[PDB]
Write a protein that binds this ligand. Structure first.
Ligand code: HEC
Ligand code: HEC
Ligand SMILES: [Zn+2]
Ligand SMILES: [Zn+2]
Ligand SMILES: [Zn+2]
Ligand SMILES: [Zn+2]
Ligand SMILES: [Zn+2]
Ligand SMILES: [Zn+2]
Ligand SMILES: [Zn+2]
Lengths: 106, 106
C-alpha cells in the first residue's frame, strides 16, 4: 500500500466508526486505522517531494534513471522511424543499467 | 504508483518489446517505460530509507502520525472496555489531527 491507500483506509474506517453498531466493530476499525497511520508515517508526501536535500547515495540512485531515460529515448527514436528490430535491440541494452542499479540499491 | 509498481511496469514492458508485433506496440511500451522510470526516480528505495536525514518539515509530518496513533489508542482502550459511545466520540476528535496535517502537507 502507498500513502494514498493508507489515507483511504483511514477515511473509510473513520466513517465505519461513525455508523458503528457495537464495540467489536469500533475496535476492528480503530485497529486498522492504527496500522495505516504507521504505514503512512514512513512515506514522503507529494508536497514535500523535491524539498529535501538528497544524499550522495540518493543522488546516484536518481542518476541511474537519467541513464535509463537516455537509452529509452534512443530506442524511442528508432520506434518512431519504424525500425522495429533496431528498437528491440536498443531496449536490450537497457538491461545493463537495470542490473547496475539493482546491484547497488536493491 | 510506488517504486515497486513502476519496476513491474518496466519489467512487463521490456518483455512486451521483446515479443512485440509492430512499431506502434514498441512505441507504446517505451513511452510507458520512460514515464515509469521518471516516476520511480522520485522515490526513496528501501535500502536508503533509514540512511537519509528528515527535514524539519518531514519530521513534523511524521510527528502528526504519532499524535494520531496516540488518539487511536485512547479510543481503542474505550472500545475494549465496551464504551461504544465514548469510543465513537474519541474517534471524532481524530479529525482535528487529520485536518491539521492536511492544511500543512496536502
Ligand atoms: C500526519 C499527516 C496526516 C494525517 C495525520 C492524516 N493525513 Fe490524510 N492525508 C495526508 C496527506 C499528505 C495526504 C495527501 C496524499 C497525496 O497527495 O497522495 C492525505 C490525503 C488524504 C485523503 C485524500 C484521499 C487519499 O486516499 O489520499 C483522505 C481522504 C485522507 N487523507 C483522510 C485522512 C483521515 C480520515 C485522517 C485521520 C483519521 C487523515 N487523513 C490523517 C496526511 C495526513
Ligand atoms: C536507478 C535504479 C534502478 C533502475 C535503473 C532500475 N531498477 Fe529495478 N529496482 C530498483 C530498486 C531499488 C528496486 C527495489 C524496489 C523495492 O524494494 O521497493 C527494483 C526492483 C525491481 C524489480 C522487482 C519487482 C518490483 O516490482 O519491484 C524488478 C523486476 C525490476 N526492478 C526491474 C527493472 C528493470 C527491467 C529495469 C530496467 C528496464 C530496472 N528495474 C531499472 C532500482 C532500479
Ligand atoms: Zn506500504
Ligand atoms: Zn507497492
Ligand atoms: Zn495501492
Ligand atoms: Zn491506490
Ligand atoms: Zn506514482
Ligand atoms: Zn500499486
Ligand atoms: Zn503490481
Amino acid at each position: 500500500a502507498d500513502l494514498e491507500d493508507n489515507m483511504e483506509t483511514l477515511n473509510d474506517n473513520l466513517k465505519v466508526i461513525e455508523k458503528a453498531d457495537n464495540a467489536a466493530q469500533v475496535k476492528d476499525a480503530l485497529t486498522k486505522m492504527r496500522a495505516a497511520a504507521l504505514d503512512a508515517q514512513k512515506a514522503t508526501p507529494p508536497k514535500l517531494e523535491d524539498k529535501s536535500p538528497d544524499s550522495p547515495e540518493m543522488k546516484d540512485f536518481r542518476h541511474g534513471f537519467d541513464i535509463l531515460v537516455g537509452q529509452i529515448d534512443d530506442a524511442l527514436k528508432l520506434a518512431n522511424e519504424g525500425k522495429v528490430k533496431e528498437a528491440q535491440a536498443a531496449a536490450e541494452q537497457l538491461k545493463t543499467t537495470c542490473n547496475a542499479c539493482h546491484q547497488k540499491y536493491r
